[PDB]
Design a binder for this molecule. Structure first.
Ligand SMILES: Cc1cc2c(cc1C)N(C[C@H](O)[C@H](O)[C@H](O)COP(=O)(O)OP(=O)(O)OC[C@H]1O[C@@H](n3cnc4c(N)ncnc43)[C@H](O)[C@@H]1O)c1[nH]c(=O)[nH]c(=O)c1N2
Ligand SMILES: NC(=O)c1ccc[n+]([C@@H]2O[C@H](COP(=O)([O-])OP(=O)(O)OC[C@H]3O[C@@H](n4cnc5c(N)ncnc54)[C@H](O)[C@@H]3O)[C@@H](O)[C@H]2O)c1
Ligand SMILES: *C(=O)CC[C@H](N)C(=O)O
Ligand SMILES: [Mg+2]
Length: 1209
């Protein structure tokens, strides 16, 4: 068999000294990067004065030389302007100019435009918003825009419509693009080519999703090289036109993880285009993209420049991004490569276009620092220093200075000195934007320095795809400052080098941008990830992973008295059974019962450890796991079948649980919050470290000793987690490990001294535990608390406003990551009928680009399922659907998978959602289509499964967001992003119905469930009072029940219903946390006062009730106000009147036990039950705790989804 990790992530080539200098600078501190940049960018006082003069002379011409004018002519509001442009865009999608004018004249200008024009008019309004207002809104308020469009048409008629159409036509055909086609762009370029300009054409392709998209982009590029070469007609690479390409357009898996495919499949295609450009002797420039593709692209640039088939041509070009901390070392490397190869490489120096996306990515991944600067002035100094380096090597490279900043331009112009010849260097600008400035530079009558115009080419659809990124003209852009008339010229010709030099601390990070580790401020330290695009990281990880596979991992029954003997068997890698991972010794049912007794007898000693010291253990346990992360990664990869990327996330999530529960402890717990006692923690195989650790850390920090029962498939990583927690100071008596199967779990739950159970697993097993536990009562006569986190049937809804490329990406990740073995995984994709065929073609194309196999290779996307039984179960489902006529799409599996348990990613097209009647825990996406008027019915079908865990929605339309998020009943919502990877303390995780009891893991109510008296969580309060509660309290006052009326009003104030908070997280995301009503609560009263207390508790938290008619208390609620009676029903057959969302029970100990057994028999969800005796209701106003009568909802909205980040102005 192949040696573990012997082929994890070998580099494309051995890393030269010059390449190593690049990698070493990836995330270098910003205070280290600047001093050498300032040294390099300095110039004589004489030069700086001449620079500021030239830069002032340029800026004064500009100030002395469209959509705004339209808004003025018709006195449009901002929303009218935006809506008018969306209307124009949709009228231009009408091809025949005469048909269009007839629709305007006879139907639009008069009738409701809403009849004549399956896709909102306002799909692109975020982009038109930028045009009109200069500000970017992530989503579209389509009801506001509809009203504005009606208003402006009813006011001004066909004339305003005509003017909108012509404006949009001019902007889309001549301003945003030089032309719609390359032939048209070439015809339009004649005029400025005569005035001394040159051109390079950008064909607006990028981010291929399928093989078909990449082939299409390739032939687009090929056919443009022909038109450009023919038009060039021998002018050469400096005077004549060239083309610019993006590598992500030519392959659907352009990434370091797929480097072998990139060199074998993408390189040959770039070489064939370059050969064509060589024959016409035109430039071919490789555009720069995200920071994690930079070094990968250098390997393509190296091979192309050493390829003798391309010799004799100096047209190959390459962009370098000055906002990147690697820029000067990249330039050293290129300059040396130009010397070795003898190719005069065309180096286009830009600042960079992905800034806010890079900030968000680094934060999300928990990396050590950013790969770009965080102050714009730092990018300027870097640009000017790299320009000096490039102007010293014009013998071997051709520098191309792409900038619109007049201060940068003047600096470069004077730095280059008096000698110039065409071919020494050039400036560059963007079509429609930079000509005014550079019409003051080009020509013998100005500065006599040439400028290449970068010219987008594309249809309306194409230009709009990333027209937002191109606009971002933000609060720090030179283009934005030259307009702003409160900015003086003296301000605009300020020298960035001298300003940075005289700052108190050179190169300081931006004050308002958090390093990834500091995302949560003083609350806690963020866990740290690893950069799998960093060759140094991959190299050192390769060795640690190899060394992890040599260990003899074991897991034993670690009882309080010491290791126990038992039945021993191997643990095999699910991706290859020949790979023995370790040995597990499993627990006898006798030692299971014995461990509970030792924990019971040791419980007082652990409760007596002060909360702050308990949390301090957890903080030490977090630090141990961060240090051992590489070794833990390797065990999770091989024991549980996970990819390295999913193993990193899992170890982070364990670290985060430990620090989050430690901080929550420091915020809440005191002497009056006593532990429950021994808690049994039972966990699933699919997050074998994270969920394992989170349940145990919570229970322990709340003062409870713990019996940890790991899933039988993943004991080894569990045993390691317990080793670490004990090393951190958890005493052996406080944390005992009991490996084994469901019998060991069932014996622990049943044991006499078990005070609480934390279960994560399947819904049916949680139903068996609930049944065990209804037989039992605590020594105080109350039910044994149960937290059950169970399965999901998670849907995503996509309408015709979504961007297919974003959707396919989020779907492929949500459904097939970890082979779909996430409780959160996407199970049902719901596609609006108009875009269903297009998205499904893309999805299937992207499916076939996934790599399935054993997960000790970075190249693997989808690993094995955990066992042969899981495989057989998943494959039964697939073949059933296949036998019912449903279209089934499956990738092909390589024969190497036969040594493991694999299921291929699978797409199944269903007719109705009720076709699918059970959670299928594998890589199996079901697809259904819906018509837009049936959206509300669709949300019902989603809710009707009974599950309620994760849910996703892709739309740009506020009315659809409002509608859908107010009707879906699920605990974790996701807008315009994937639906997996909830982050501790940011998206507190957990659902409702068949998906769990709550409270949410990694949320502020979790610890309260594990003590006898719940504390008040941080920020847990609400100023809102439920109005039916208030009517009930008045009814009680009317009936003479003064004391109960007062209790009712106190419950109204104590309720946290309506709490609405935003939680700190990464930039580019809004993460919200809210408390809602749970639903209909089953009330089982014994006395009239008991019923009034129960009803006040339920109403104060927004719930309706079903009251046990067998109680005989019907006459205690005569003459209810109508508002309260709407919320009240009576029930004789509890099972018929479900599903309920909780229960309140009054009785003595045996009444409680009987009612509890009858509630556990109700079909459907596990109910969170609270019981109290009549005397407890009288003595304790919190006998029924309001924390468990509300439902937590987490929502995460990707606010960078329109293409940029507004807040990072
Ligand atoms: C001809 C041509 C061709 C291209 C490009 C430009 C031109 C003129 N660009 C885009 C370029 O990188 C840049 O985004 C804009 O052109 C604006 O730069 P200026 O010098 O015009 O303006 P300006 O001088 O106002 O500089 C603005 C720039 O500063 C940076 N910035 C803003 N805030 C910052 C902060 N807080 N911290 C650090 N930096 C900050 C950004 O890079 C921003 O673009 C590009 N880009 C790319 O990545 N790949 C490519 O292939 C191209 N192609
Ligand atoms: N809501 C969540 O946060 C969440 C997270 C992960 C997984 N899950 C769910 O867990 C399931 C997959 O994991 P699984 O296959 O390991 O679950 P499972 O129900 O098969 O097994 C879970 C655990 O319970 C034990 N067990 C089995 N029978 C038992 C019994 N009669 N009494 C006591 N313990 C018993 C097992 O040994 C194991 O430790 C899926 O349904 C998935 O959706 C939910
Ligand atoms: C379920 O398996 C846990 C999944 C995790 N919380 C996530 O991916 O959100
Ligand atoms: Mg099982």
């Amino acid at each position: 068999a192949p040696a573990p990790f012997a082929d994890f992530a070998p580099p494309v080539r051995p890393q030269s000294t010059l390449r190593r200098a690049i990698t070493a600078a990836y995330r270098r501190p910003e205070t280290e990067c600047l001093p050498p940049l300032v040294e390099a960018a300095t110039q004589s006082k004489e030069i700086r004065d001449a620079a500021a003069s030239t830069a002032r002379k340029l800026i004064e011409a500009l100030r002395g030389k469209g959509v705004e004018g339209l808004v003025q002519e018709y006195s449009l509001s901002s929303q009218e302007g935006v809506a008018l442009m969306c209307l124009a865009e949709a009228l231009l999608r009408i091809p025949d100019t005469a048909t269009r004018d007839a629709l305007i004249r006879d139907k639009i200008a008069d009738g409701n435009w809403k009849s004549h024009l399956s896709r909102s008019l306002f799909v692109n309004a975020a982009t038109w918003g930028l045009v009109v207002t200069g500000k970017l809104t992530s989503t579209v308020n389509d009801r506001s825009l509809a009203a504005a469009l009606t208003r402006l048409i009813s006011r001004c008629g066909e004339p305003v419509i005509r003017r909108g159409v012509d404006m949009a036509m001019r902007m889309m055909g001549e301003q945003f693009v030089t032309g719609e086609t390359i032939r048209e762009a070439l015809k339009r370029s004649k005029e400025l080519e005569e005035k001394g300009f040159s051109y390079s054409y950008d064909m607006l392709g990028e981010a291929a999703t399928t093989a078909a998209d990449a082939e299409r982009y390739y032939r687009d590029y090929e056919s443009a090289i022909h038109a450009i070469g023919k038009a060039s007609a021998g002018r050469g690479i400096y005077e004549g036109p060239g083309i610019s390409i993006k590598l992500s357009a030519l392959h659907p898996r352009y990434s370091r993880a797929q480097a072998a495919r990139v060199m074998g499949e993408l390189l040959p295609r770039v070489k064939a285009l370059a050969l064509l450009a060589k024959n016409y002797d035109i430039g071919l420039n490789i555009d720069a993209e995200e920071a994690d593709r930079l070094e990968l692209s250098l390997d393509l640039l190296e091979v192309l420049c050493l390829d003798g088939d391309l010799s004799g041509w100096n047209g190959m070009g390459f962009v370098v991004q000055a906002y990147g901390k690697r820029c000067p070392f990249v330039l050293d490397f290129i300059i040396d490569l130009a010397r070795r190869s003898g190719r005069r490489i065309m180096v286009r120096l830009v600042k960079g276009a992905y800034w806010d996306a890079e900030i968000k990515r680094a934060q999300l991944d928990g990396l050590a620092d950013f790969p770009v600067f965080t102050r714009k002035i730092h990018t300027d100094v870097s640009y000017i220093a790299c320009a000096a380096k490039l102007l010293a090597a014009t013998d071997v490279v051709f520098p191309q200075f792409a900038t619109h900043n007049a201060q940068t331009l003047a600096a470069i112009y004077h730095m280059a000195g008096k000698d110039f010849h065409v071919g020494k260097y050039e400036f560059q600008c963007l079509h429609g934007m930079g000509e005014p400035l550079y019409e003051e530079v080009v020509g013998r009558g100005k500065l006599d320095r040439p400028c290449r115009i970068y010219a987008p080419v594309g249809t309306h659809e194409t230009l709009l795809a990333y027209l937002v990124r191109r606009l971002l003209g933000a609060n720090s852009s030179f283009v934005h400052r030259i307009n702003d008339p409160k900015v003086s010229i003296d301000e605009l010709i300020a020298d960035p080098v001298e300003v940075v030099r005289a700052m108190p601390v050179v190169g300081a990070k931006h004050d308002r941008i958090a390093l990834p580790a500091e995302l949560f401020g003083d609350a806690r330290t963020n866990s740290a990830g690893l950069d799998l695009s960093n060759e140094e990281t991959l190299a050192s990880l390769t060795e640690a992973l190899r060394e992890s596979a040599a260990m003899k991992w074991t897991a034993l029954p670690q009882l309080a008295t010491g290791p126990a003997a038992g039945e021993t068997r191997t643990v095999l890698n699910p991706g290859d059974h020949r790979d023995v991972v370790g040995s597990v010794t499993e627990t006898s049912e006798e030692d299971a019962r014995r461990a509970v007794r030792l924990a019971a007898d040791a419980a007082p000693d652990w409760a007596a450890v002060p909360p702050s010291e308990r949390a301090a253990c957890l903080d030490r346990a977090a630090e141990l796991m961060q240090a051992r992360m590489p070794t833990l990664l390797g065990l999770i990869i091989r024991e549980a079948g996970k990819s390295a990327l999913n193993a990193i996330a899992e170890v982070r999530e364990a670290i985060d649980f430990l620090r989050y529960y430690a901080e929550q402890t420091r915020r809440t717990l005191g002497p009056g919050h006593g532990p429950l006692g021994p808690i049994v923690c039972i966990s699933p195989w699919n997050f074998p470290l994270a969920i394992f650790t989170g349940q145990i850390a919570a229970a322990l920090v709340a003062g409870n000793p713990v019996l940890a029962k790991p899933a039988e498939e993943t004991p080894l990583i569990a045993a390691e987690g317990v080793r670490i927690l004990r090393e951190a100071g958890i005493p052996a008596s406080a944390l005992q490990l009991l490996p084994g199967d469901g019998r060991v779990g069932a014996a622990l739950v049943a044991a006499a001294e078990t005070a609480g159970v934390m279960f994560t697993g399947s819904t049916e097993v949680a139903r068996l535990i609930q049944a065990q536990l209804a037989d039992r009562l605590s020594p105080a006569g109350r039910p044994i608390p149960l937290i059950a986190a169970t399965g999901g049937q998670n849907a995503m809804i996509v309408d015709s406003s979504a961007l297919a490329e974003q959707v396919v990406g989020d779907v492929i990740t949500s459904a097939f990551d970890s082979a779909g073995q996430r409780c959160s995984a996407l199970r049902v994709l719901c596609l609006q009928e108009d875009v269903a065929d297009r998205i499904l073609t893309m999805l299937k194309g992207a499916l076939h680009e996934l790599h399935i196999g054993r997960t000790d290779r970075l190249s693997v996307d989808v690993g094995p399922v955990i066992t042969s039984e899981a495989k057989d179960n998943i494959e039964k489902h697939i073949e059933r659907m296949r036998g019912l006529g449903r279209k089934v799409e499956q990738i092909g599996l390589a024969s190497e998978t036969g040594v493991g348990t694999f299921v291929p990613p699978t797409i199944i097209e269903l007719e109705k959602l009720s076709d699918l009647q059970r959670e299928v825990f594998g890589p199996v996406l079901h697809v259904i289509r819906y018509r837009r008027d049936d959206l509300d019915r669709l949300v019902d079908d989603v809710n009707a499964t009974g599950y309620g865990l994760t849910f996703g929605l892709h739309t740009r339309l506020d009315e659809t967001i409002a509608h859908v998020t107010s009707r879906i009943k699920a605990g974790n919502l996701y807008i315009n992003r994937n639906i997996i990877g909830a982050v501790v303390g940011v998206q507190p995780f957990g659902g409702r119905g068949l998906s769990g009891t709550g409270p949410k893991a990694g949320g502020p109510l979790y610890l309260g469930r594990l003590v006898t008296t719940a504390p008040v969580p941080p920020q847990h309060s609400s100023v809102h009072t439920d109005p039916v509660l208030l009517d009930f309290a008045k009814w009680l006052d009317g009936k003479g029940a003064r004391a109960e009326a007062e209790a009712a009003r106190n419950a109204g104030s104590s309720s946290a219903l309506g709490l609405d908070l935003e939680l700190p997280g990464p930039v580019g995301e809004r993460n919200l946390y809210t408390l809602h009503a749970r639903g209909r609560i089953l009330l089982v009263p014994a006395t009239e006062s008991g019923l009034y207390h129960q009803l006040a508790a339920a109403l104060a938290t927004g719930n309706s009730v079903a009251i046990d008619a067998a109680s005989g208390l019907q006459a205690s609620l005569k003459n209810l106000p109508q508002t309260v009676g709407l919320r009240v029903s009576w029930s004789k057959d509890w099972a018929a009147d479900g599903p309920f969302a909780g229960a309140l029970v009054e009785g003595d100990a045996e009444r409680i036990r009987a009612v509890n057994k009858a509630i556990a028999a109700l079909p459907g969800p596990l109910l969170l039950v609270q019981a109290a005796s009549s005397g407890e209701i009288a003595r304790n106003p919190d006998a029924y705790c309001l924390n468990w009568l509300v439902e937590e909802v987490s929502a995460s909205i990707n606010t960078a989804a329109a293409g940029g980040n507004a807040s990072l102005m």
